[PDB]
Structures are given as structure tokens and as C-alpha cells.
Structure 1
Amino acid sequence: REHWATRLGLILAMAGNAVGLGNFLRFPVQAAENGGGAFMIPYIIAFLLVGIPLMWIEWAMGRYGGAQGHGTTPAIFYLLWRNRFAKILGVFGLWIPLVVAIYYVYIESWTLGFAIKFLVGLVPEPPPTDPDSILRPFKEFLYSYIGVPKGDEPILKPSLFAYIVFLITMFINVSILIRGISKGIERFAKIAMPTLFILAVFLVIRVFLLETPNGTAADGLNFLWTPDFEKLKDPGVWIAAVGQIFFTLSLGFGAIITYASYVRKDQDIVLSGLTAATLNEKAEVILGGSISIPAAVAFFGVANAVAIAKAGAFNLGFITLPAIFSQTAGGTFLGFLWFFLLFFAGLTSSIAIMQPMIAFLEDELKLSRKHAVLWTAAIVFFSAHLVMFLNKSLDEMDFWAGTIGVVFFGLTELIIFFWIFGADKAWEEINRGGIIKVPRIYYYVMRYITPAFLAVLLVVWAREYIPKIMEETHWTVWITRFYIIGLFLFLTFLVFLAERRRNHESAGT
């Protein structure tokens, strides 16, 4: 089995897995919608009670499974729990990352397309003037790129440029993945992560210099880091915070598991795990948080910024920020650096999200790396046409796989590892080979606190928030639901084909 060549390469690859569009696009929107500093206390508590323990748990499960030649959850779940139901539940660790891949790579392709056009100066020219005279050209720029519906049909019409750039993005992901773990992912991570950090720091510095009659970058920081204790009682803030923690640390996607399955059987995961997670948190709260919000607040004031963030998920990063930059000397190039940053943030993450599918085809169906990568790319590419051409399909996939799915899977994987497989056996598996040991308190966190936290969360979620979406949606959501249910059935069938293959091999020996 392939292994990570160096410890640094391991850490940077795992940091690249976690550090992504979630740090720079999702986090600021989530924090801004939920009162800035009011979002941060639940967020921090979620990092400690959920983020950290699940990270160690997923590293352990992957390392454990990798030692036996298995990097994905259909097989790994079965190793921890010898029941046919474990294989079925394991299918989610293939389904979640595949479905997320289908929209994540497409959004990643936009950052590349924007980087290209911003570099060559093929951007909108605002009148040299109210905010809307500045923002509108950039709104139309995004709208023409992804092809937002101009009528009442729920159909998107991406530009030819956007489509070709998606193909190129897919090509770039394949070029890295096809070279494997050490010579592809690990090697790229060593080049990508320092670069990414450099760009982000520069952007933070450049944004900290923003100043207008409406305020400064410092105002944006104070809004993000000023605690509001009268919001700790709102369930909505906790749900948003835990969902961000999952999304940001790549947890519940079966993808930390798969990466960890290339860690050598006795190699450390306690310090490595903690370090990869802390690296992500710094890139998130210090870098991601210091760019978008402070810039928006400096130009529009706190109240307007919050309204912008609420407007959409992509408004702040694809419209507002580049519009703001356009009013600053060298702002088009700064727009380029921002989109180039997002692209490397996306790319280092999308190779991670597609690897579980690759690992499954290699490990369980005995495909070569070449074939596993190409077939995986083929499924993601073909499937992405749904997200490219059907308005709101992206939203539906992100809800079922990237939002609900990950929390459910987080709880599932913990129960299987710490309850079914055995708490003391799990505790010993995590700690084996550790450069440091997991603090004793975290045994009781993992066994009792974390599962109860997630279970209560999911209950409050399904009671007071999901019935508002099962009745209040356009019929076209069923196209996406139909298709991704079909993907789950497809993956179940492959797991079935893999158990049959394993049986025929065992018979002929």
C-alpha cells in the first residue's frame, strides 16, 4: 500500500484537505449571519467537543483500516463491526464525498475562471456613484459566468468559458491524483500550502489597510470577536457552528479516514491530527476571518455587511470583495490574488474529496490507480452537469451530503468506533504510536459528551428546521434527490460487487 513519504508532507496534505473554500468563503458568511462574535463561542466549544475528538477518531479509523489494506468506510466499518449493516452504513463514506465533489469542484472551477479573467483584466468597469453602481457590474459578471436564470425556468446557462474551465479544473485534479499519494497529493501539498499561506497573509495585510468614511478593517474584526452572550441560547447558532466545524475540518466525509489509511500502522496520529486541525483553525479564524468581513465592513459598515452575507453564499466572495477591490489601486490584481488563493484552497481540498472513491476502487475492486482516477473523474464530471444546468441543485446536494450527511456520519462513525468496537480498544488504537497522548478527559468526551452533543443537535435540527424544507421547495429538488439516491444505490451495488469478488478470491485459495 502507498504511504505518505514524510511527516511534513502528511501534515501539509492533511492541512490542504481541511483548509479550503470553507475557510475563505463559508466561514465568513456563517459568522456574519450569526452575529459575528455571537457565532464564535459556540464555534470554539464545537471545535473542542466535536472538532478535535472526531479528528482523532477519523485518523485512528483510517490508520487502522489502512494497515489491513482498506481506506474507505464500507470495509472499515465492517472491520470494527462485523455486520452486514456496517457495510451499508459505510456506503455513506463514499456517497457523501462523491456528492460533495460534484458541486465542490464546479465552484472551484469558478475561482480559476475568475483568477484568469482578473489576471488579464477582462473584468467589469464600474462608473468612476452609489454602491449599486459599483456592485451591479460584478453581480452581472458572476451571473453571466454561471448563467443565472433570466426568466422563470429553473435552468442555468453557463458561459462557454465557465464550461471549458470546469474541464480544465477536472484535468488539473486528475493530473495530481493520477500520480498517487506521495508523488501527487503529498508533493503538491508541499508546494500549495506555503503559497496559499503567503497569499492569504498578504491579503490580510492589504485588507487591514482598507479605510473609508464608512469605517476601517478594525471595525470588522471587533464585530467578529466581540462576544454576545444572549445568543448562546439560540439553537440556530449552535447548529450553524457545528456544521461549520464539520465542513471546515473535513469531518464526516470519509475523507480524513481515507488520507489516514496511508499513514503507517505505528506512525503518530495524535500530534499529527491535532496539528492539521490547528493549522486549519488558524487559516480559518485568523486568515479567512480577516479578509472578507473587515473589507466589507470597512466599505459598507457592520449592518450592511451582515446583510450582504445573508444575501447569498457566493455574493460576498464573488461579487462584494472584487467590487470593493476595484475601488483600490491595483485592485484588479488583488482580485486575482484572492481568486488564485481560493483556487489553491479548493484544489488541495478537491483532491482529498475524490480520493475516497479512488481508494475504494483500488482497495476493494482492484482497479489500478490510473483507472480508479479516470473513472472517478468521469462520474464527477458527468454528474456535475446536473449542478451546472439545474438551478439550486448545488444547494440540494450541499444540504443532504455536506450538511445533514456529515453530522449523521460523524455520530455514526463515533458510535461504531467508541461504542460497538469498544471504547477502551478505540482509546488504545488512537493513542498507539502517539508522540503525545490524548488527555484523559477526552476519553469521557469521546464516549459520552460528543455523541450526546451530536444526537441532541440532530434532534433539534430534525424537529424545528427540516419540516420547513420538506414542504417549502420547488418540485425540481426531486430531480437532485432522485439522482443522488441513485448514486447511493450505485455505490451500494459496487460494495456488493466487491464482497462477491472477495468471496471468489477466497474460494480459489
Structure 2
Amino acid sequence: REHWATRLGLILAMAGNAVGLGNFLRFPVQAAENGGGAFMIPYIIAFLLVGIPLMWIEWAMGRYGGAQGHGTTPAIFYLLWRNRFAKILGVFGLWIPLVVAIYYVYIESWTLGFAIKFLVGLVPEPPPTDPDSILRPFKEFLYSYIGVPKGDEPILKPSLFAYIVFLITMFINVSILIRGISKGIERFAKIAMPTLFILAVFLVIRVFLLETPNGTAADGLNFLWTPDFEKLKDPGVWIAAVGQIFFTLSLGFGAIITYASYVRKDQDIVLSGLTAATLNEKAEVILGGSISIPAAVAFFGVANAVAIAKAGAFNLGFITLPAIFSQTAGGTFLGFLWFFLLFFAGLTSSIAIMQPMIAFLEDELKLSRKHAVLWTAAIVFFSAHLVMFLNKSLDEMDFWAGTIGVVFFGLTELIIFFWIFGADKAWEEINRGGIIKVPRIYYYVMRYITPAFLAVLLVVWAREYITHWTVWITRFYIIGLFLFLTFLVFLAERRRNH
């Protein structure tokens, strides 16, 4: 089995897995919609009671599987629980990252396309201070790129440029993945993470120097880091925070598990796991939180920035921020550095959610790396045409896989590892080879607090929160993908028989 060459390259590959579009795009929008600092308390508690323990569980399950030659959950679940239902439940750890990949790689492709155009200066020109006259050209710029419907039909029409950039983005993902774990993912991470970090720091400094009659960047930081204890009674904030924690740390995606299955059976996962998780949180609360919101607040004030963050999820990052930047000398270039940052952040993450399917084909169906990567790219590429051409298909996939799926799957992998396999075996498996030991309090968190936390959350979700007819096209398609992956698991157990 392939293994990570260096401890550092492992940390950075895992950090790269976690540090992505979620830190710079999803987090600020989530924090601004939910009272800024009112969001941060549940977010921290979620990190301590959900984020940390599940990260340790997923590293453990991964290393455990990999030692027996299996990198994915259909098989790993079966090792921990010798039951046919374990294999079926394990299909979600191929389904979730695959469905997520289908839309995530497309959003990643936008950032590349915007980087190219912002570098070459093919950008909208606002007139030489009326906000709507400055924002609109950048709105139209995004709308033409992705092809937002102009009438009644729920159909998108991406520009020719957007389509070819998607193709290039796929080609780039493939070229990294085809070289494997040490020479591909690890090598790229060593280049990509330092670049990503430097670009983000530069932008944070640049944003910190912004001031208008409407405000400063520091008003954005005060909005984000000032608690509201009255909001702590609102369950919506808690549901939002926990969802962000999952998405941001790549928990419940089978992506951490798979990367961990290339950690040698002896090697530490406790300190490594905690460091990768902590690097992500820095890049999210310090770097990601410091760019978009403070810049929006400076130029528009708090209440306008909140309203912008509620307008959509891509309004802030693809419209508002580059619009703001265009009002400053060297702004088109500053736009380029932002989108380049986003591209590298997306790229290190999307290779993490394509690798589970690659690992399944190699481990269970015995395809070569080349064939496994090429077929995985073909399924993502083909499937992506749904997200590219059907309005709100992205939202449907992001809901079922990226939102509901991950929490369900997190609770499931915890029940399988810590309740069925055995709480004492699991704990032994986590700490085995550890540089540091996991605090004793976390045994009771993992066994009782985390699962009760998530079960209560999911109860309120499917009873107090659960559209156009076209959402059924996407549901149909992704259900079919699940059935298809079930077929492959079936074929894998048959190959093992013969």
C-alpha cells in the first residue's frame, strides 16, 4: 500500500483536505447570517464536542482499514462490524464525497476562470460612488459566466469559457491524482499550502487597511467577535454552526478516513489529527473570517453586509468582494490574488473528495491508479453537467450529501466504531502509536456526548426544517449514483469470493 513519505506532507495534505472553499466562502456567509459573534460560541463548542472527537475517530478508522488494505467505508465498516448492512451504510462514504465532488469541482472551476480573467484584466468596469452602479456589472459578470436564468425556465447556460475552464480544472485535478499519494497529493500540498497561507495573509493585511465613510475593517472584526447570548437559545444558530464544523473539517465525507488509510499502522494520528484540525480553524476564523466580512462592513456598514450575505452564498465572494477591490488601486490584481487563493484552496480539497472513489476502485476492484483516477474523473465530469445546466441542482446536491448526509454519516461512523466495534477497542486504536494521548474526558465525549449531541440535532432538523419540480431530476440522479455504487460494492464482494 502507498504511504505518506513525510510527517509534514501528511499534516499539510490533511490540512489541504480541510482548508478549502469552506473557509473563505462558506464560513463568512454562515457567520454573518447568524449574528456574527452569536454564531461563534456554538461554533467553538461544536469544534470541541463534535469537530475534534470525530476527526480522531476518522483518522483511527482510516489507519485501521489501510493496515488491512482497505481505504474506504464499505469495507472498513465491514471490518468493524461483520454485517451486510455495514457494507450498504458504508456506500455513503463513496456517495457523499462523489456527489460533493460533482458540484465542488464546478465551483472550484469558477475561481480558476475568475483568476484568469482578473489577471488578464477582462473584468467589468464600474463607472468613474453609487453602490448599485458598482455592484451590478460584477453581478452580470458572474451571471453571464454561470448562465443564471433570465426568464422562467430552470435552465442554466454557462459561457463557452466557463465550460472549457471546467475541463481544464478536471485535467488539473487528474494530473495531481494520477501521480498518487506521495508524488501527487503530498507533493502538491507542500507547494500549495505555503502559497495559500501567504496569499491569505496578504489579503487580510490589505483588507485591514480599508476605510470608507461607512466604516473600517475593525467594525467587521467587532461584529464577528462580539457575542450575543440571547441568540444561544435559537436552535438555527446551533444547526448552522455544527454544519459548518462538519463541512469545514471534511467530517462525514469519508475523505479524512481515506487519506488516513495511507498512514502507517504505527504512526501517530493523535497529534497529527489535532494539528491538521487546528491549522484549518486558524485558516477559517483568522484568515477566512478576516477577508470578506471586514471588507464588506468597511464599505457598506454592518446591516448592509449582513443583507448581502443573505442574498446568496456566492454574492459575497464572486460579486461583492471583487467590486469592493475594484475601487482600490491595483484592485483587479487584488481580485486575481483572491480567486487564485480560492482556486488553490478548492484544488487541495477536491482531490481529497475524489480520492475515496479512487481508493475504492484500487482496493476493492483492483484497477490500476491510472484507470481508477480516469474513471473517477469521467463520472465526476459527466455528472457535473447536471450542476452546470440545471438551476438549483447544486443546492440539492449540497443539501443531501454536503449538509444532511455528512451529519448522518458522522453519527453512523461513531456508532459503528465506538458502540459496535467496542468503545475500549476504538479508544485503544485511536491512541495506539500516539505522540500525545487523547485527554481521558474525550472517551466519555466520544461515547455519550457527541452521539447524543448529533441525534438531538438531527431530530429537530427532520421535524422543524424539512420546491420546484426540477429538484426531482437531481434526487433521481443521485439516488441512481447510490444504487450504482451499491452495485460496485456487490461486484467487489463477488470478486473477493472468486
Note the C-alpha offset of 1:303: 0.3
Note the C-alpha offset of 1:48: 0.1
**SS of the residue 1:328 aligns to:** coil
Q: Deviations over 1:96-148 (max 9, x none)?
A: 00000000000000000000000000000001131000000000000000000
Q: Deviations over 1:318-348 (max 9, x none)?
A: 0000000000010000000000000000000
Q: How big is the alpha-carbon RMSD for the aligned residues of Structure 1 and Structure 2?
A: 0.3
> Match for residue 220 of structure 1?
220
Note the C-alpha offset of 1:302: 0.2
Instruction: State how far apart, in whole Å, the 2-side matches of 1:173 and 1:444 are.
Output: 40
Q: Deviations over 1:230-270 (max 9, x none)?
A: 01100000000000000000000000000000000010000
Q: Deviations over 1:5-54 (max 9, x none)?
A: 00000000000000000000000000000000000000000000000000
Q: Percent identity?
A: 100
Instruction: State how far apart, in whole Å, the 2-side matches of 1:479 and 1:178 are.
Output: 32
Q: Deviations over 1:214-242 (max 9, x none)?
A: 00000000000000000110000000000
Note the C-alpha offset of 1:475: 0.2
- Is residue 477 of structure 1 aligned with residue 477 of structure 2? no
Instruction: State how far apart, in whole Å, the 2-side matches of 1:408 and 1:387 are.
Output: 23
- Is residue 321 of structure 1 aligned with residue 321 of structure 2? yes
> Match for residue 330 of structure 2?
330
Note the C-alpha offset of 1:69: 0.3
Instruction: State how far apart, in whole Å, the 2-side matches of 1:57 and 1:493 are.
Output: 28
Q: Deviations over 1:69-100 (max 9, x none)?
A: 00000000000000000000000000000000
**SS of the residue 2:221 aligns to:** helix
Instruction: State how far apart, in whole Å, the 2-side matches of 1:232 and 1:258 are.
Output: 35
Q: Deviations over 1:454-498 (max 9, x none)?
A: 000000111100xxxxxxx00000000000000000000000000
Instruction: State how far apart, in whole Å, the 1-side matches of 2:81 and 2:124 are.
Output: 57
Q: Deviations over 1:182-220 (max 9, x none)?
A: 000000000000000000000000000000000000000
Alignment of 1:18-417 (within 5 A): 18-417=18-417
Q: Deviations over 1:125-178 (max 9, x none)?
A: 001131000000000000000000111000000000000000000000000000
**SS of the residue 1:232 aligns to:** helix
**SS of the residue 2:52 aligns to:** helix
Instruction: State how far apart, in whole Å, the 2-side matches of 1:118 and 1:14 are.
Output: 30
For normalisation by structure 2, the TM-score amounts to 1.00
Instruction: State how far apart, in whole Å, the 1-side matches of 2:303 and 2:153 are.
Output: 33
**SS of the residue 1:229 aligns to:** coil
Instruction: State how far apart, in whole Å, the 1-side matches of 2:32 and 2:71 are.
Output: 37
**SS of the residue 2:59 aligns to:** helix
Instruction: State how far apart, in whole Å, the 2-side matches of 1:414 and 1:129 are.
Output: 54
Q: Deviations over 1:330-370 (max 9, x none)?
A: 00000000000000000000000100000000000000000
Instruction: State how far apart, in whole Å, the 1-side matches of 2:91 and 2:107 are.
Output: 25
Instruction: State how far apart, in whole Å, the 2-side matches of 1:128 and 1:106 are.
Output: 34
**SS of the residue 1:253 aligns to:** coil
Instruction: State how far apart, in whole Å, the 2-side matches of 1:379 and 1:462 are.
Output: 31
For normalisation by structure 1, the TM-score amounts to 0.98
Instruction: State how far apart, in whole Å, the 2-side matches of 1:409 and 1:498 are.
Output: 22
Instruction: State how far apart, in whole Å, the 2-side matches of 1:488 and 1:457 are.
Output: 25
Instruction: State how far apart, in whole Å, the 2-side matches of 1:446 and 1:304 are.
Output: 41
Instruction: State how far apart, in whole Å, the 2-side matches of 1:351 and 1:399 are.
Output: 21
Instruction: State how far apart, in whole Å, the 2-side matches of 1:233 and 1:70 are.
Output: 43
Q: Deviations over 1:293-321 (max 9, x none)?
A: 00000000000000000000000000000
**SS of the residue 2:230 aligns to:** helix
Number of aligned residue pairs:
497
> Match for residue 496 of structure 1?
490
Instruction: State how far apart, in whole Å, the 2-side matches of 1:442 and 1:49 are.
Output: 9
Runs of 4+ in 1 over 6 A off after TM superposition: none
Instruction: State how far apart, in whole Å, the 1-side matches of 2:213 and 2:102 are.
Output: 43
**SS of the residue 2:266 aligns to:** coil
Instruction: State how far apart, in whole Å, the 2-side matches of 1:232 and 1:411 are.
Output: 23
| Runs (5+) with no aligned partner, structure 1 | 466-472, 505-509
Note the C-alpha offset of 1:419: 0.2
Instruction: State how far apart, in whole Å, the 1-side matches of 2:115 and 2:61 are.
Output: 38
**SS of the residue 2:250 aligns to:** coil
Instruction: State how far apart, in whole Å, the 1-side matches of 2:234 and 2:36 are.
Output: 14
**SS of the residue 2:66 aligns to:** helix
Q: Deviations over 1:379-418 (max 9, x none)?
A: 0000000000000000000000000000000000000000
> Match for residue 470 of structure 1?
none
> Match for residue 461 of structure 2?
461
Instruction: State how far apart, in whole Å, the 1-side matches of 2:333 and 2:360 are.
Output: 41
Note the C-alpha offset of 1:180: 0.1
**SS of the residue 2:267 aligns to:** coil
Instruction: State how far apart, in whole Å, the 2-side matches of 1:230 and 1:210 are.
Output: 31
**SS of the residue 1:101 aligns to:** helix
**SS of the residue 2:153 aligns to:** coil
| Runs (5+) with no aligned partner, structure 2 | none
> Match for residue 7 of structure 2?
7
Instruction: State how far apart, in whole Å, the 2-side matches of 1:82 and 1:392 are.
Output: 39
Instruction: State how far apart, in whole Å, the 2-side matches of 1:274 and 1:266 are.
Output: 17
Instruction: State how far apart, in whole Å, the 1-side matches of 2:433 and 2:367 are.
Output: 31
**SS of the residue 2:169 aligns to:** helix
Instruction: State how far apart, in whole Å, the 2-side matches of 1:390 and 1:41 are.
Output: 37
Q: Deviations over 1:437-460 (max 9, x none)?
A: 000000000000000000000001
Instruction: State how far apart, in whole Å, the 2-side matches of 1:432 and 1:156 are.
Output: 51
Instruction: State how far apart, in whole Å, the 2-side matches of 1:395 and 1:289 are.
Output: 23
**SS of the residue 1:138 aligns to:** helix
Instruction: State how far apart, in whole Å, the 2-side matches of 1:262 and 1:422 are.
Output: 23
**SS of the residue 1:115 aligns to:** helix
